[PDB]
Design brief:
The structure is a monomer. The protein has 282 residues and is of the alpha/beta class. It has helices at 5-22, 81-90, 102-106, 176-198, 223-233, 243-253, 262-273, and strands at 60-65, 68-73, 96-98, 120-122, 125-138, 141-152, 158-164, 214-216. The chain has an eight-stranded mixed sheet with strand order 1-2-8-3-7-6-5-4, sandwiched between helices. The structure holds vanadate ion. Vanadate ion binds at residues 170-171, 217-224, 260. Vanadate ion (VO4) is lined by residues 170-171, 217-224, 260.
Length: 282
Amino acid sequence: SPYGPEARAELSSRLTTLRNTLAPATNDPRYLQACGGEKLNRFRDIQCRRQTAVRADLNANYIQVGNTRTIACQYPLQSQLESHFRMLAENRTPVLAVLASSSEIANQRFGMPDYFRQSGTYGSITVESKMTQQVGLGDGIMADMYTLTIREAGQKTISVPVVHVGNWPDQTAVSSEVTKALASLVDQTAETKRNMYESKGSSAVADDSKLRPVIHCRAGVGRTAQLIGAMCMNDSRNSQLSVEDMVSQMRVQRNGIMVQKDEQLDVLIKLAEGQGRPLLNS
Ligand code: VO4
């Protein structure tokens, strides 16, 4: 079987060789380095590929797999918040999907600010949050939805819709069913906001560095990548993209940890198998 153990075995030696090869070296020129003392990375070993970096002071990357464009990033640190909101607005973010649980956010030791469920002022910017709906995606997983209104004097006000999956534990894989259900909710939400921009004649709709969904969990490599992988798979234009290319592209464009657990990989393999999609190149 193309999805047999032998094949999944081949898939692993490949991705594994790639993970070892991309592990950051001290002052690695392939990765963005923090400066002036301020901390850049949340996890010293989960770094940000310099070439595809969105901003110099955020750990966050522009990702494209096949034809799917997104921005995967780390849960911002308290200090990175003003820039993080700038990246949101100028990207004219169609949808912010946050995959970090409320209990991780609630744990004050983890240093994960509640930037999206509460109003605030971050430097020049002013944010306002408004909860809208709650969608059940299956297996007891819920997604709460907000709208963030970002304002900064002299800039045009931007609204961003957020889909927060509040109960997906770090280091785990939600099921293929919950997974595709979430990929859909994210696309639909993005497609509705993009259309609002389109019906308005914004230039951002023409620019391919803008209007990309932003997605992050805590580290931005596991839960964030399981979702990126599924969004790629429901884009019809991504036909014949193997699981090997998909994963290789996420790793070369952010870091080697992309698709952190082997079970998150497994869900990606199940969705593929169900599409008759290929695992291995050649
Ligand atoms: O915060 V996450 O990258 O799933 O492990």
